Subunit: 271 residues, 3 copies
Amino acid sequence: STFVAKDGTQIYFKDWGSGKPVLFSHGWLLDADMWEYQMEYLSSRGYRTIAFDRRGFGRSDQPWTGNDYDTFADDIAQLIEHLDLKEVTLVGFSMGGGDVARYIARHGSARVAGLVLLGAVTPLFGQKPDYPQGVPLDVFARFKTELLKDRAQFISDFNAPFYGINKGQVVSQGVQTQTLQIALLASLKATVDCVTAFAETDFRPDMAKIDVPTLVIHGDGDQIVPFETTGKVAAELIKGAELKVYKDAPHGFAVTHAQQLNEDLLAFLKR
Amino acid sequence: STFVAKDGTQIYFKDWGSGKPVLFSHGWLLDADMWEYQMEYLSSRGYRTIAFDRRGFGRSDQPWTGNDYDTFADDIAQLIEHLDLKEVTLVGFSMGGGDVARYIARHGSARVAGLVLLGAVTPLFGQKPDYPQGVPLDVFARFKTELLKDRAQFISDFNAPFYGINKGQVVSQGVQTQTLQIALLASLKATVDCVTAFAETDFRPDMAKIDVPTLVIHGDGDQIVPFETTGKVAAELIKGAELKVYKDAPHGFAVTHAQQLNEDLLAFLKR
Amino acid sequence: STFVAKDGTQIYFKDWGSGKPVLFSHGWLLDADMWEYQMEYLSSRGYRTIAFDRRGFGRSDQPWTGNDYDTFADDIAQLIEHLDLKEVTLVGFSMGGGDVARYIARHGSARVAGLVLLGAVTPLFGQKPDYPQGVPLDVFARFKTELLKDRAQFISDFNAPFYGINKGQVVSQGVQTQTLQIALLASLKATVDCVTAFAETDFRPDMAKIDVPTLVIHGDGDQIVPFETTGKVAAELIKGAELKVYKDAPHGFAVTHAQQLNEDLLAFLKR
């Protein structure tokens, strides 16, 4: 399916099944396909699942402008309005934790029943004056430098630390191939702009506006988004939030810990 | 090109050349690109060739519902009426033999000049009480179990027995790579639903409704769709049907026996 | 974005940034993505960049007809009119040098501010009676025979001489994988037809109609499109044309010499 955003950007999405809606927001480099197993799992169990390709990624258009969290959040708002969704459970992975949070902050939670943050960059990823524990911005500067030289090889190299293959996790060549194939669909511009967005956007104000049941899941083996300065803190800043830590799990735990995630999502919805 | 099915599913197709129409229906996991060599061959020789991506596959939309043979047949019906095709020759490979057969069963043969069944699941694939020689359903249950864990690697592993690489056939890395690339485009849900469809659908009633010239081609080295209980039987059940067995050919013989297939299709059309 | 050509073919394109427009025409097998780095470079420096997927390639439709330079040129004309572009700088790579040249020859240069020909087939690629120095046509006949057997492996094998990997150039597996992925999106028919097009089309008449500032860049290590009989001659035949030769550079120098190309394009725009 598609809808057209305010600025004319065509956004691809899937809308599967029937029942209370669960809307998924993918991470950097990937697209809606990253959720295929969670969507099938939940939609065969009484839920309606929706997942979009973020502007500049997957099967969506690749605008030069609007590659920032305020726009990402408004895109989600437009999708929700387009489908006229109510009592929706928002689920975000990695940088996608940011735009579902920013959606709530900018638009409120009248249409929202719950929030799930998976290995998310919330409440803040990069260093700030009062957050020296964050990731130094020159780390992300180097991401950009390498992406602007050879993004294809960057993505390929990213697989190892993403899935924790360098630390004993087992992930098939097939999954690594699919990851690279999907990532290559994306815009070079969007890919680099997203680094700026997730490196420097402060979601701490957002946390204070989240007034729905919230579940935070993170792997404490995460090499990409440090548990200690993200997931751990988000769970504290969001009133009433629940926290689940997957022991030694990597960043890409929707793959390595798929069954566990599926069951945790279902249990959250049934609460 | 695209058309929109009754339920809103956008279906991608290619319509090449001019002359009497030949409409191709692809097998599981693939898309219209599997036919590219037959299409170029025939359209360069005075025929119009049409090939669609089955709902849930390739460049087509990925609906949660309608992943069954009755719907597949009605999609074909819509395409045919869409283009107002007449004296069309239907060509189906593997599970695609099922939906062209079901099209004739459901809609009749007024627009149809002939039928070609290539390594097809017709008249019946999986076991039934009166068909113990069929493939045990637990084989297909296992397919689903593996697909719901890691479909990417399933596809990759499938290449070997599909093309008979494990049994003396030579297929390039390029072909194997393209096969995987195309298969990854598909929906996880459609991929799994199709297993249920081709595993359990009985086309024996369909065979009695086929009242047009028919050519059945099958490799007797087929590791995926057993010749003895499919093609061999279809050729007997369809009145006046012709049977050609490609010696030692694997399931994916459109690749391994391309030239022979091209020439046989042309000969059938010129009968 | 998309527009619809005269014959109904839907063409995909990207339109990034603002300012004086720069329109890119890609080479054989590739698509608009080959320009991603040049587009980001220039659009972050005050220019508007536009790149399309040629009919039959990338994300564009795959027509059976119209796979020839006159049609390619008219496609470009339609895009230029669609966006009402003025003072546009046309940039063509390999076979794409042909359709920007043919656009000017067919439509004039009223809307054109400049022309850049990168490793282009201009003014003539294959042999003619008065051009025995060109590439013998049996070389291209061989391309076609191999493509019509296994285009996937042809593309894979083409990577080496294309990027000069067989002669000391270093190119990542990622780049080679992305190259293959994009090429496989294309139509078999368009792919083969393009060989006929670039093999036999004479652009010498076109050279005389080019009345705008022109920059010709070519690698003198180019194993695909011979500098001595293409770029070298084009620079002489086009009045006022500037010539830059990248020492030992391969055909695919937008990859191997990306930074040098970026800077040369900017310098040309700033003259």
